Ligand binder design. Structure first.
Ligand SMILES: Nc1nc2c(ncn2[C@@H]2O[C@H](COP(=O)(O)OP(=O)(O)NP(=O)(O)O)[C@@H](O)[C@H]2O)c(=O)[nH]1
Ligand SMILES: [Ca+2]
Ligand SMILES: [Mg+2]
Ligand SMILES: [Mg+2]
Ligand code: NA
Length: 166
């Protein structure tokens, strides 16, 4: 069966772990325990294909930015997450995409841009601003809430569908 190596990246506190745990374990993590580097694996059927998702949940705290080069080499597709109530986390996305491009030596790496925490009303990043950024990269933009599970499966499955176009 096909294995897909997915990597979840983004600034501290944007909901990377909450998104991944919703997908894999179907509950919402309310507390904030910062991640170093955790792996998850789930067998799923996507568009009639049985496949294994191997998901790497990475650190957003900049103290671990050294580990980025390694997981960027081995990842096949990247979920670039920001939070829609954290302007700085959106501004930080470009850093992540430039580093992925350099390490992969490619302008066409499978990626999806994810605006998380869309259940919150304190929005400072408007959907149109994120759509424009994703359009410049040539990738989809999807909004999610790990709390309500809105968009969670869609974000990860869309990334699988992007890896298949490459
Ligand atoms: N309301 C709401 N809260 C969320 C959502 N996603 C995450 N959170 C909350 O935000 C906090 C941080 O979430 P977490 O997944 O740990 O963030 P992270 O990106 O993995 N942090 P790190 O990079 O340090 O590992 C938690 O308190 C969590 O419950 C969401 O979609 N909505
Ligand atoms: Ca909980
Ligand atoms: Mg985390
Ligand atoms: Mg504004
Ligand atoms: Na980076």
């Amino acid at each position: 069966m096909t294995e897909y190596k997915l990597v979840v990246v983004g600034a501290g506190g944007v909901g990377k772990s909450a998104l991944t745990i919703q997908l894999i374990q179907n509950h919402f993590v309310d507390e904030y325990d910062p991640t170093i580097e955790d792996s998850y694996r789930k067998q799923v059927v996507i568009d009639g294909e049985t496949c294994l998702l191997d998901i790497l949940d990475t650190a957003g705290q900049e103290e671990y930015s050294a580990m980025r080069d390694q997981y960027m080499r081995t990842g096949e597709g990247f979920l670039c997450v920001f939070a829609i109530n954290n302007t700085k986390s959106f501004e930080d996305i470009h850093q992540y995409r430039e580093q992925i491009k350099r390490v992969k030596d490619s302008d066409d790496v499978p990626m999806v841009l994810v605006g998380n925490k869309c259940d919150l009303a304190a929005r400072t990043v408007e959907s149109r601003q994120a759509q424009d950024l994703a359009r410049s990269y040539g990738i989809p933009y999807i909004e999610t809430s790990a709390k309500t599970r809105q968009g969670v499966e869609d974000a990860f499955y869309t990334l699988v569908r992007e890896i298949r176009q490459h």
